[PDB]
């Protein structure tokens, strides 16, 4: 189906401790494949997925230089941001960047992204048309004027329509068997008296992370007291999720769990 | 691959 490549930059300033920490992580869909950390022994782009390892020295060298320059740029940006908000020179602040491309099954551009947050709040985003910016702030307006004069949006569009799509294409080709992977969940139900009793619907080892787990009453859903935890990484590039209802020990053969995941040929119905 | 400048120096912000 659709696929996306995404990069996540985090830059954190320090009080009087030198240069901000820059970290970058790259994903294709729910799979991370590259990292960079400026605080590492030697700051270097490293592989995090098997299908990116085949990349030759020039790839890591170049991408590493990109990360280094971007780190410098993020530092100056943190400086300017400190200025815009009249924050003190001693504070520690965060600049986050989030960009990348979504393509369809034909591998052509569907949507582009490029946006920034300062101290955890939306600061400035490239619009859907990929030609203008939405500034969240009075400060972000300064950034907006600065970029509009320098026509930066055109360059971001150039990336998102150009190299982004091409690289994503190459990664989907090289990692096909794991990126076009759809691992259906391994599912089961557990029960704990207290005793009100508890039913737990378990889904483990699935990919991608997108999944739906519902507890129904004779066919109408008990979102109400279903206790639903976040989808979590298993640590082996698969994900886990479970839902829970506490009920009394009465009429349990109509509590149904329904699992929908794109690796399932048909939606699953579970009962203990 | 991450975004490079295509021949100049980055935005600022």
């Amino acid at each position, epitope marked *: 189906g659709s696929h996306s490549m995404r990069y996540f930059y985090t830059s954190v300033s320090r009080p009087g401790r030198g240069e901000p920490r820059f970290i970058s992580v790259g994903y294709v869909d729910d799979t991370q494949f590259v990292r960079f950390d400026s605080d590492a022994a030697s700051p270097r782009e490293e592989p995090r997925a098997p299908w990116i390892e085949q990349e030759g020295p020039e790839y890591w060298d*170049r991408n590493t*230089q*990109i990360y*280094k*320059a971007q780190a*410098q*740029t993020d*530092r*100056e940006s943190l400086r300017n941001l400190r200025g815009y908000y009249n924050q003190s020179e001693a504070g520690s602040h965060t600049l986050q960047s989030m960009y990348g491309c979504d393509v369809g099954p034909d591998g052509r551009l569907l949507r582009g992204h490029d946006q920034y947050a300062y101290d955890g709040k939306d600061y400035i985003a490239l619009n859907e048309d990929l030609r203008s910016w939405t500034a969240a702030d009075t400060a972000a307006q300064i950034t907006q004027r600065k970029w509009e*004069a*320098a*026509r*930066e949006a055109e*360059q971001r569009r*150039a990336y998102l*329509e*150009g*190299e982004c799509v*091409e*690289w994503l294409r*190459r990664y989907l080709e090289n990692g096909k068997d794991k990126l076009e992977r759809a691992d259906p969940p391994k599912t089961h139900v557990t029960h704990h008296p207290i005793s009100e009793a508890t039913l737990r619907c378990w889904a483990l080892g699935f990919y991608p992370a997108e999944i739906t787990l519902t507890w129904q009453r004779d066919g109408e859903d008990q979102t109400q007291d279903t206790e639903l935890v976040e989808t979590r990484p298993a640590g082996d590039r698969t994900f886990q999720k479970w839902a829970a209802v506490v009920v009394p020990s009465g009429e349990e053969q109509r509590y149904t769990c329904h699992v929908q995941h794109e690796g399932l040929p048909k939606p699953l119905t579970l009962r203990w | *691959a991450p975004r*490079g*400048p*295509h*021949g*100049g*120096a*980055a*935005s*600022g912000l």
Partner: T-cell receptor
Amino acid sequence: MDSGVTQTPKHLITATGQRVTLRCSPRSGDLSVYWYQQSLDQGLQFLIQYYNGEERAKGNILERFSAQQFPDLHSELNLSSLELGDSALYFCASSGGHTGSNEQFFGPGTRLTVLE
Amino acid sequence: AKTTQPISMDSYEGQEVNITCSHNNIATNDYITWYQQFPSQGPRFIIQGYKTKVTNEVASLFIPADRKSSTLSLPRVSLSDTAVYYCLVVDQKLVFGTGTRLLVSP
């Protein structure tokens, strides 16, 4: 802008084995400075690029060539132990500010003639 | 990669001037970039493109699907356009070849 990249001095004649320093001011708003060398009937060869005081990129630059970018963003390229082959046009460029992200704004250049 | 382009080209004012550039090994990150330079003066950015044809106020730039070639097209040259034109494929560094020296005659 408003002010383009500036380079001083316009020219320089100096004996082999000696030392010179070339000065450059980036275009107003630009935080990044480049140095290039143009030998006779050649394209420019990239020497070194700084961003906001920090070295960002090196070319095939000899260690006797050494550069610097100061807090006011102006830069100095000092050429040491000069020899005949160092005779060239030395260009300074700027970016990262008002100049577009994909462009470099070049100064008028400093002409260096090294004589024995 | 590297770029190979004509060493020189002649033209009369009023004509269209098309300078083609070869770059068989253009990399995914490389952008097709052209610079102009008058003698002993700072070179100036002309135009840049990736996949599709680009037209601006000074010139056009044709780019085939392979990306192995490109053509700088100056719409109607004048004596002012006598200069050296550099074709580059660019990621981080500007690597200048010898460029095409274009002479515009009356």
